[PDB]
Structure formats: C-alpha cells, structure tokens
C-alpha cells in the first residue's frame, strides 16, 4: 500500500484535481490484489497466481490510459481503474461464477474505499468500451466498434494472408483485450484458447491493425539455442535502433525444448537480456546506440545511460504473445507454472467455441444459399437461434 | 514416414499458409522461403497408435 | 554510538519515469535486504535468493 | 438428429456407395487396398477430401 501509494502519487500528476485520492486507489488496488489472491487459488486453476506485478500492471495500465485518455471526472478515473482491474486480474478466470465473484468484489472494493454513486454498471461489459478506433482511448458506442472491426477484418482477411474467417461478438471482446494489451508499456500476453479458437490469427490481426512487426520464431527438432538467441537478438535490435515496435508470437508448436522457456523468463520479467549482446557484439551495439540516441537529439554521457535508454526501448516497444491450448499437459504446464511467464504475461482465457458463436460461425458459412424446398414442419417439438429455416435446422443438427 | 515424431518446420505447411506472388507461391520453412508447386501432395504416416 | 532503525529515503519520480523497468520504491525491507546483501558480499561468502 | 429437427435423409444410405466411383473403388483395390468396407471408407476420406 505504501509502495503503490507512491506510484499513484506519481501518475496522478496528470489529474491534479483528484490528487487527494492517491491512498484510496492504492489501498483499493492492494485490497483487490489481496482478495483476488485469496479467493482464486492454485487449487482450482494452475494459473491463478498473483504477485506485486499485478499491482504494478494495474498502476501502469492506469497511467497510460489517463495520459492518453480524455478529460477525467472521478467516475472516469475509478471506472478506468475498474477496467484495468478487470483485465489485469479477472481476465484469466475460467467459467462464469468466478468472473461474477470478481465483479462482486470489485463493487465491494469501490464501496469500501471510494464511495461515488455516479457509477453505472461496473460489470465486465458496460465498462471496458476501450477506445482504439477513437483516437484517444475513451469509452465508445459499441455499434461503431463492431462495424470498424468488421470492415478492418474484411480488409485484413483480403489484404493479408487468406485463411477464410468468420466474425462473432466473442471475437470482438478478445480483440479489444489483445489491443489494449499490446498498447501497455511493458507488457505481454498469453492467450489460453484451447486450439483452432483463432487466437494466433487474432493476435496477427491486432498486430496488423496497429502496424506492429510480427515475428514468429522459426524452429524444429534440430533447432539450437544459438538459433533462438539470434531471433531474439535481431528482434531486440530492431525494437531499439529502428523503433520497429514488434510483436513476437510464440505458439506451443514452436517449442521443441524448454530453452525457449527461460531466455524469455528474463526478457519478459526484466526488460533486457544481459548475455545476449556480448564480446565485441556488445561494442558494436553500443556504437549504434550512441548514433541513434544522438539522432534523437540526446547526447548521453555515460555508457549505462545509453544502455538504460536501450532497455527502456525494449520495454515499451517489444511485445510478446504466447498462445497455448491445453494448460493441463506437462509440456504446456512447464510453460504455465513458470512464474516470469504467468506474472508478466497477461493471461487471457479463451476456450472451446461458445456454442452460440458456433452458430454464428455456422450461419456465416451457409450464407451462400443452395438451400431448397419447404420446411414441412416449422419446428414443432423440443440454442442456435429461434429456428425457422432449413438453415437453422442444419446448424442445430451440426 | 514417422508421424509419431513431428517438427514444426512443417507447421506453416500443415496449416495452409503461403505468401502469394505474381506467379510464384512461397512458404517459409525454417530460415528459408521455398516455392510451392501445387502438383505437390503430402501424406503423414505413422505406425504405433501409442 | 546509537541503535536506531527504519529511516528511509523519500523518492519522487516524474510520471514518465514511472515506466522505467529498473526502478525501486525504497521500503524498510528494501534497505534491510540491500544491506544484508552487501554484508554477505563483503564477507566473500556467496548468496542465493529463493 | 436429422430426424429430431426436420430434415430428410436417405433412410437407406451407405457412405461408400455415395462418395466413391466404381473406377475409384477399382483403382484403389488395384494399388493393394484391403477388401474392407472400412478401408474403403477410409481411403475415400483420405483421397476424396484434402483441404
Ligand atoms: N472464425 C473462424 N472461421 C473459420 N476457421 C477458423 C476461425 N477461427 C479459427 N479457425 C480455424 O482455426 C485456425 C485459425 O488459426 P489460429 O489462430 O492459428 O488457430 P489457433 O487457435 O491460434 N491454434 P493455436 O496455434 O494453438 O493458437 C484455422 O486453421 C481455421 O481452420
């Protein structure tokens, strides 16, 4: 509470009016952190782990969103808080009751610390409404979002690689989540989606939307550690020297060995890898850094200053996205427990199709109309849709 | 011949992913971009159900 | 000669400095910990943090 | 399921007869394929469908 009271005191310089509220956000933030850590435990799910990082992410997320965001009222700040609260903590939660448990906790927290009645519904929907299409990250209209996304998804489906795809509300929520995640300063994400859920291709969509350079590590059974180093090595150089802002997509297919686990335990957690640039290779990098720095209009005296600028560059401009399927097997669970992963990865839980979106997919595929005759029986007996057509019958059977 | 063991260099080939050109069609494998034919077929084969 | 404890430096860092990954908000435990690291390291004995 | 929602299917139906040519059936068995309905159902699924 003391640590993060200092943090809020630092980020609230952007909203001096609300300066008085430094402690109760810090208190409410640590409270939530404690309760969450208490309610959801590793006995239920392997990935329920909470560390101070979650408190770190919550402040950081709020900082950027305030800074980039519109003029704030108290309601504005505390809802924004609740958004980041949702994404940092609850987005990892499976099922429903647990997400509802979190909503209840959120309501309780707000009531206990910051009692304003100007709030609306604070549930996971009714809040996030996270502006991307709108230039400053405000709340949005939701009809505009779905359309913007859909036209930019039509564009992306045609312009970039063509794997026929389908849209659903389900997609939209996770899209906002992936984008907001790639917007946050030092941050990475892991999508637990089962498989075929369309999580990699969605990452790629946002990467295409925000014009981030996509890198998928190319490896195999004979692939070495020296090989993965060079990928990371080159990826970092571009993230710093050329200001490329790259998104590195790791699948669980990609790992033939754990060596991939660890070197990133580093890159995620802290902002650099010390071993990676070494020997003369270090001096070459340093030279370049001096040049780029001086070209930015900053002459940095010491060497560590250059390297401090460099690391900060890796932090804000390099995002990593894991996509894993079955957290339950030992191969992925090695990825899972591993803390530097789970605690600097924003865990986002997708799963098998929603059985509703199964219809949205099905219906959008049978959109072409070969379908004939009459329904002798408007269904008279007995979740896809209210069933009228042969179309609906088919997607219900399937 | 051994599907039992499978390395992801083929991953871009299993999922259908290709960067199209005017004439050529290319698929990244490992560190190199190779041209696909289209008279090309693939069959993965394994023996033990284990 | 006296025995006193838990005296800490006050830090104020600008908003844009909040995003630096290498940062520390000094707490009682920070100082206490940093100090036993030093003492151990001046004894040439090794450290492992778990 | 095709019955429960109302959609007609051919009460007498066999996968093989539906999706395989005589020539196909003949051609596969020539390459050494086993006699079974099973291995014919299979050989159809492998050949007949590649996306
Ligand atoms: N909306 C969709 N419409 C049609 N097929 C889809 C859709 N979403 C996903 N798929 C299928 O799933 C794949 C989408 O790519 P991808 O995102 O890589 O799946 P994935 O969930 O990421 N599997 P993984 O590599 O473990 O993450 C394609 O091969 C499609 O067959």
Spell out the SS3 assignment of chain A: CHHHHHHHHHHHHHCHHHHHHHHHHHHHHHHHHHHHHHHCCCCCCCCCCCCHHHHHHHHHHHHHHHHHCCCCCHHHHHHHHHHHHHHHCHHHCCCCHHHHHHHHHHHHHHHHHCCCCCCCCCCCCCCCCCCCCCCCCCCCCCHHHHHHHHHHHHHHHHHCCCCCCCCCHHHHHHHHHHHHHHHCCCCEEEEECCCCCCHHHHHHHHHHHCCCEEECCCCCCCCCHHHHHHHHHHHHHHHHCCCCCEEEEEECCCCCCCHHHHHHHHHHHCCCCCCCCCCHHHHHHHHHHHHHHHHCCCCCCCHHHHHHHHHHHHHHHEEEEEEECCCCCHHHHHHHHCHHHHHHEEEEECCCCCCCHHHHHHHHHCCCCCCCCCCCCCCCCCCCCCCCCHHHHHHHHC
Breaks (C-N over 2.5 A) in chain A follow: 382
Cα-based torsion angle of the residue sequence A39, A110, A172, A180 in order, rounded to the nearest 10 degrees: -90
Tally the residues of chain D. Answer: 51
Regarding chains C and D, contact by 3 or more CB pairs under 8 A is answered as no
φ, ψ of residue A316 to 5 degrees: the values are -80, -30
CA atoms within 13 A on the CB side of A276: 22
CB A178 within 8 A of CB A189: yes
Cβ-based neighbours of D3, under 8 Å, separated by 6 or more: none
Q: Six-digit token pair at A62?
A: 């709020």
φ, ψ of residue A387 to 5 degrees: the values are -100, 115
Closest CA to A326 of A196, A233, A201: A196
- Going by the DSSP 8-state scheme, the letter that residue B16 receives in this structure is T
CA distance A157 to A159: 6
φ, ψ of residue A113 to 5 degrees: the values are -115, -55
CA distance A20 to A154: 47
Cβ-based neighbours of A206, under 8 Å, separated by 6 or more: A175, A178, A179, A182, A212, A247
Tell me the C-alpha to C-alpha distance, in Å, between residue A27 and each of A36, A89, A380: 14, 16, 58
Closest CA to A311 of A359, A283, A273: A273
Task: Answer whether D6 sits within 8 Å of A377, measured CB to CB.
Answer: yes
Q: Facing residues of A246 across strands?
A: A213, A318
Q: Is the dihedral of CA A9, A15, A18, A19 positive or negative?
A: positive
| B46 Cβ under 8 Å from any chain A Cβ | no
Starting at the edge strand found earlier in the chain, the sheet holding B19-20 runs B19-20, B25-29, B32-35
CB A249 within 8 A of CB B12: no
Expressed in percent and rounded to 5, the helix, strand and coil fractions of chain C are: 35, 0, 65
Distance A139 CA to ligand 1 centre (A): 30
CB A80 within 8 A of CB A68: no
Closest CA to A363 of A168, A108, A193, A158: A168
- Going by the DSSP 8-state scheme, the letter that residue D4 receives in this structure is T
CA distance A134 to A68: 11
CB A33 within 8 A of CB A55: yes
Q: Six-digit token pair at D48?
A: 């007949």
State the nearest Cα–Cα gap between A167 and chain C, in angstroms: 36
Cα-based torsion angle of the residue sequence A305, A307, A311, A312 in order, rounded to the nearest 10 degrees: 20
Tell me the C-alpha to C-alpha distance, in Å, between residue D37 and each of D17, D18, D21, D40, D47: 10, 13, 14, 5, 15
CA distance A370 to A376: 18
CA A45 to chain centre: 19
CA distance A86 to A122: 10
CB A346 within 8 A of CB A189: yes
Task: Answer whether D5 sits within 8 Å of A376, measured CB to CB.
Answer: no
Regarding chains B and C, contact by 3 or more CB pairs under 8 A is answered as no
φ, ψ of residue B49 to 5 degrees: the values are -70, -15
For A19-51, b where at least 16 C-beta lie within 10 A, e where not — what string?
eebbebbbbbbbbbbebbeeebeeeebebbbbe
Closest CA to A83 of A183, A218, A211: A183
CA distance A181 to A176: 8
CA distance B34 to B19: 10
Distance A217 CA to ligand 1 centre (A): 18
Query: Would strands B32-35 and A213-215 be described as parallel, antiparallel, or unpaired?
Result: unpaired
Task: Answer whether A270 sits within 8 Å of C19, measured CB to CB.
Answer: no
Q: Six-digit token pair at A144?
A: 């505009």
Closest CA to A267 of A248, A281, A286: A248
Instruction: Mutate one of D1, D6, D8 to test the A interface: name it (highest A CB count within 10 A).
Output: D6
Burial of B30 (0-12, 13-18, 19+ CB in 10 A): middle
CA distance A132 to A239: 22
CB A209 within 8 A of CB A343: no
* Residue at token pair 């379908």: A371
CA distance A119 to A104: 14
> Is residue A200 in contact with ligand 1, taking CB distance under 6 Å?
yes
Cβ-based neighbours of A345, under 8 Å, separated by 6 or more: A188, A189, A190, A268, A320, A322
| C29 Cβ under 8 Å from any chain A Cβ | no
> Is residue A360 in contact with ligand 1, taking CB distance under 6 Å?
no
> Is residue A165 in contact with ligand 1, taking CB distance under 6 Å?
yes
* Residue at token pair 């390099």: A318
Name every chain C residue with its beta carbon within 8 A of the beta carbon of A14: 15
- For chain D, the chains sharing at least 3 beta-carbon pairs closer than 8 angstroms are A, B
CA distance A7 to A13: 11
* Residue at token pair 């502006």: A131
CA A331 to chain centre: 23
Task: Kindly give the interhelix angle for A97-113 and A74-88, rounded to the nearest 10 degrees.
Answer: 150
Q: Six-digit token pair at A339?
A: 């803390």
Closest CA to A313 of A224, A202, A235: A235
Burial of A161 (0-12, 13-18, 19+ CB in 10 A): middle
Q: Whose CA is nearest to atom 30 of ligand 1?
A: A196
CA atoms within 13 A on the CB side of A231: 24
Closest CA to A29 of A64, A63, A56, A65: A56
Starting at the edge strand found earlier in the chain, the sheet holding A318-324 runs A213-215, A246-251, A318-324, A188-192, A345-349
């Amino acid at each position: 509470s003391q640590i993060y009271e200092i943090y809020y005191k630092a980020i609230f310089k952007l909203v001096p009016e609300f300066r008085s509220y430094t402690e109760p956000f810090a208190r409410a933030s640590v409270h939530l952190y404690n309760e969450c850590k208490a309610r959801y435990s590793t006995g239920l799910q392997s990935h329920y782990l909470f560390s101070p990082r979650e408190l770190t992410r919550l402040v950081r997320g709020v900082y950027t969103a305030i800074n980039t965001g519109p003029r704030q009222t108290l309601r504005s700040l505390i809802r924004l808080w609740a958004y980041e609260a949702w994404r940092i903590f609850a987005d990892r939660l499976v099922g429903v009751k647990e997400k509802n448990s979190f909503e209840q906790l959120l309501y309780e927290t707000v009531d206990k610390y910051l009692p304003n009645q100007d709030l609306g519904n604070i549930s996971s929907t009714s809040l996030l409404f996270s502006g991307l299409l709108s230039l400053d990250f405000k709340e949005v209209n939701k009809t505009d979002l779905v359309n913007f996304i859909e036209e930019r998804f039509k564009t992306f489906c045609d312009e970039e690689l063509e794997v026929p795809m389908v849209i659903h509300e389900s997609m939209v929520d996770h899209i906002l989540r992936i984008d907001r995640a790639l917007k946050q300063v030092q941050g990475h994400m892991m999508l637990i989606g089962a498989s075929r859920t369309g999580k990699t291709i969605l990452t790629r969509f946002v990467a295409w939307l925000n014009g981030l350079k996509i890198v998928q590590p190319k490896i195999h059974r004979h692939s070495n550690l020296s090989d993965f180093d060079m990928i990371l090595k080159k990826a970092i150089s571009d993230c710093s020297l050329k200001e490329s802002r790259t998104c590195l997509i790791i699948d669980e297919s990609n790992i033939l060995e754990t060596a991939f686990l660890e070197r990133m335990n580093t890159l995620l957690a802290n902002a650099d890898i010390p071993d990676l640039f070494q020997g003369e290779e270090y001096d070459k990098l340093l030279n370049n850094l001096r040049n780029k720095t001086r070209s930015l209009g900053l002459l940095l005296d010491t060497e560590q200053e250059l390297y401090d600028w460099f690391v900060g560059e890796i932090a804000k401009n390099l995002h990593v996205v894991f996509t894993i399927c079955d957290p339950t097997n030992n191969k992925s669970s090695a990825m899972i427990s591993s803390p530097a992963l789970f605690n600097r990865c924003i865990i986002n839980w997708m799963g098998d199709w929603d059985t509703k979106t199964m219809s949205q997919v099905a219906n959008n595929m049978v959109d072409v109309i070969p379908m004939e005759f009459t329904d002798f029986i408007v269904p008279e007996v007995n979740f896809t849709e209210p069933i009228q057509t042969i179309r609906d019958a088919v997607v219900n059977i399937l | 011949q051994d599907g039992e063991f499978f390395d992801p260099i083929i991953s871009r080939l299993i999922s259908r992913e290709f960067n199209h050109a005017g004439n050529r069609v290319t698929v990244e494998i490992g560190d190199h971009e190779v041209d696909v034919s289209g008279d090309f077929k693939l069959f993965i084969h394994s023996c033990d159900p284990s | 000669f006296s025995s006193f404890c838990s005296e800490i430096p006050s830090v104020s860092l600008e908003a844009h400095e909040v995003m630096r990954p290498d940062i520390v908000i000094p707490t009682i435990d920070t100082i206490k910990h940093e100090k036993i690291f030093y003492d151990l390291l001046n004894s040439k004995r090794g450290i492992i943090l778990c | 399921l095709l019955g429960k929602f109302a959609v007609k299917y051919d009460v007498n139906y066999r996968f093989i007869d539906y999706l395989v040519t005589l020539d196909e059936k003949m051609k596969w068995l020539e390459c050494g394929l086993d006699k079974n309905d099973y291995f014919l159902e299979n050989m159809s699924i492998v050949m007949n469908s590649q996306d």
